[PDB]
């Protein structure tokens, strides 16, 4: 009776719990009995039933159609799945020929939104209507009959809120921000250099919308020593590639490319033509009004006492970028651990503001 | 007994019974995670040993 119930429930609970575990191990063995399957790239499509492949596992092969295969989508250098013995097309994958994870470092959205960095507002405004609108609405530019925009340039010192503006345009679109190190685009092998640029452009269209952000265009571009030969042909090959895709039959539509350069005068005049870079944004030192809006935002997200004075800090600050406001918060905070608190106070604030002023102009 | 790479050319069984150390860039064979207690033995083939660099395997023969 009483005895029988106490076992019955407990035994009912046990059998289910064991059962889920045992089936998982049995599904596992099934998954393992499966056999490998070699990857290649289609070199070019020979017919509708014969294809030429450069294997990514072997020598050169003629391979054929299997069943219900995509027969008009196999193009140069797309990665494909081939059978181990059958040697027919098992699947098509997206094109890949270079890692996507270190030669391309990905930041899905942006670190901050585009109205939380506010006091860079003019630059926010004119990045927003050039970059966001053709990505979201390619249709308005098609309907007018003008070209969607091509390239956009950020220039000025890095961290004037330069980095902010680039991260921030991407967030609002929900683009992926893709940081490319320009030197790594410097492989010393045949066509590696060709390969890398192309693959970013191909990936930009697959994973669309996307920002391809190319940092420094004086390790793959620039005006060089005089543009002779000293090892200035590696640099010349890299720039030539950028120029050929832009000017040519290829184009930029849901691939936006963004150039970054310490000072804009250092860039080849081909890059300075429209049809490479149409948009050229400058990043100056903010306004007093501009400083004011950025400080109120910055100090807001930091907890502080009612007796804090925004008015005093803004008055002391002239020639301050977003970075300089951020330093005043952290500097005060050293004095605030020191004064044995858990919040930032006018006493911490004044000292901090004067020190950050002193160290610079 | 010099060996600095030790094939045994598909002696096959199996858990285990291949017990072959190759130290060569092409083919990395690790018999790791501490002890296998053996009297003399990895596997057969004139070449029980653990190359010039040891993927565990505490020094038979």
């Amino acid at each position: 009776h009483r005895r029988y119930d106490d076992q019955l429930k407990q035994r009912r609970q046990n059998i289910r719990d064991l059962e889920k575990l045992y089936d998982k191990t049995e599904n596992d063995i099934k998954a393992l009995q499966s056999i490998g399957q070699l990857i290649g790239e289609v070199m070019k499509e020979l017919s509708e039933e014969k294809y030429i492949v450069k294997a990514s596992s072997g020598p050169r092969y003629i391979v054929g159609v299997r069943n219900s295969v995509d027969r008009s989508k196999l193009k140069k250098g797309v990665r494909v799945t081939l059978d181990i013995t059958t040697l027919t097309i098992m699947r098509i994958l997206p094109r890949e020929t270079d890692p996507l994870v270190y030669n391309m470092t990905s930041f899905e959205q942006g670190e901050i939104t585009f109205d939380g960095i506010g006091g860079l507002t003019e630059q926010i405004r004119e990045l927003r209507e050039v970059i966001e609108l053709p990505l979201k609405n390619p249709e308005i530019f098609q309907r007018v009959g003008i070209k969607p925009p091509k390239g956009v340039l950020l220039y000025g010192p890095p961290g004037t809120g330069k980095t902010l503006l680039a991260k921030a345009v991407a967030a609002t679109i929900g683009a992926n921000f893709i940081f490319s190190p320009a030197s790594g685009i410097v492989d010393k092998y045949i066509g590696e250099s060709a390969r890398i640029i192309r693959e970013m452009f191909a990936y930009a269209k697959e994973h669309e919308p996307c920002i391809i952000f190319m940092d420094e265009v004086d390790a793959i571009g620039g005006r060089r020593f005089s543009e002779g030969t000293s090892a200035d042909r590696e640099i010349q090959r890299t720039l030539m590639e950028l120029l050929t895709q832009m000017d040519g039959f290829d184009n930029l539509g849901q691939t936006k490319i963004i150039m970054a350069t310490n000072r804009p005068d250092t860039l080849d005049p081909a890059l300075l033509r429209p049809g490479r870079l149409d948009r050229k944004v400058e990043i100056p030192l903010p306004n007093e009004a501009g400083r004011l809006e950025i400080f109120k935002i910055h100090t807001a997200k930091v907890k502080k006492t009612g007796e804090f004075d925004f008015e005093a800090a803004v008055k002391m600050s002239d020639g301050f970028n977003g970075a300089d406001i951020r330093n005043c918060a952290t500097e005060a905070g050293f004095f605030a651990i020191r004064d044995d608190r858990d919040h930032i106070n006018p006493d911490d604030l004044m000292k901090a503001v004067r020190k950050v002023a002193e160290v610079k102009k | 007994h010099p060996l600095q790479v030790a094939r045994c050319t598909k002696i096959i069984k199996g858990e285990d019974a291949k017990y072959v150390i190759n130290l060569k860039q092409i083919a990395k064979f690790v018999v790791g995670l501490g002890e296998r207690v053996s009297p003399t033995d990895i596997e057969e083939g004139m070449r029980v040993g653990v190359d010039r660099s040891k993927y565990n395997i505490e020094l038979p023969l």
Binding site: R11, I15, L18, E19, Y22, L32 | -
Partner: protein, 33 residues
Amino acid sequence: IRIFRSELQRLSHENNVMLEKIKDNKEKIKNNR
């Protein structure tokens, strides 16, 4: 009273049925490793 008793023997049996089933899988994994 009856309902509880009859259920309870079948539940004891089903634990054994699983115990074979998992025993077999474990054997399989050993050949594969």
